Write a protein that binds this ligand. Sequence first.
Ligand code: CU
Ligand code: CU
Lengths: 150, 149
Amino acid sequence: KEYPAGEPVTMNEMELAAVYLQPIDMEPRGMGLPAAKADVHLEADIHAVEGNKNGFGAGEWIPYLTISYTLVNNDTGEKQEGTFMPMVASDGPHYGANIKMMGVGNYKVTYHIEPPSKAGMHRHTDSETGVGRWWKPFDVSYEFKYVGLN
Amino acid sequence: KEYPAGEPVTMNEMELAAVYLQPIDMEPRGMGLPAAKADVHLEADIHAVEGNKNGFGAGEWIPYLTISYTLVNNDTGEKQEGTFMPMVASDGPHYGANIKMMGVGNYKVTYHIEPPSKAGMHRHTDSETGVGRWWKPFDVSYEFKYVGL
Ligand SMILES: [Cu+2]
Ligand SMILES: [Cu+2]
């Protein structure tokens, strides 16, 4: 049971979507909220589309991103902020975190995305094997209605 | 991927090959060997194969690995230790480094490989979407004859 958070959007030759699930157990455990103390596992789903200039083929996961989120309950104004961790689940690698939500309501979440160069991935720059410069850091936002999972 | 280094190995539901090519330029050339001071760019080409239990589909690049190498010129006995960086080129992501070789001859290179957990990748362990435990760190070796480029 996976829940869409807003609509996927394409920016910088990547398709970027936000989704959530019931809370997960992660290894290493003890980092972040345990499933029992969270309402959802929120993810950033990010893959190359056709035309990617940074060396990724269409559909490939984009690794080494640094992603922060700012989550606002629009009904109350209460917010929370954090960073996602890279992880892998049975249908592949993604970025995510367990999240305790802030009640039923209309939410907005914004993901601030930093390119792979900022977490240790290097690019070939020669004419023979090289790729283009990385895109500049950017934001994407999603609006969704949270009603709980049960 | 220009010059194959030995034969690919399939282990831990990954195919692992070594290749080298001419020295390349890297952004921003940080802690690494400049192309003008190197003989080759040596790479680890590592992708999941079918039955991978760690969440990767067939042919997918394995990200977040930590890889070091031990390179031995078997003819002279001279040894070199170093590490690879994650790297993207026109044909996709890989791990590699510019390397100064130790003369022409028969070589062995061993890659020492640590799983994505060491570089900060977490795993779902839940029943519905969880994956198996990571494999333990391991070595893969390649024998090749280096004659220059
Ligand atoms: Cu997740
Ligand atoms: Cu490289």
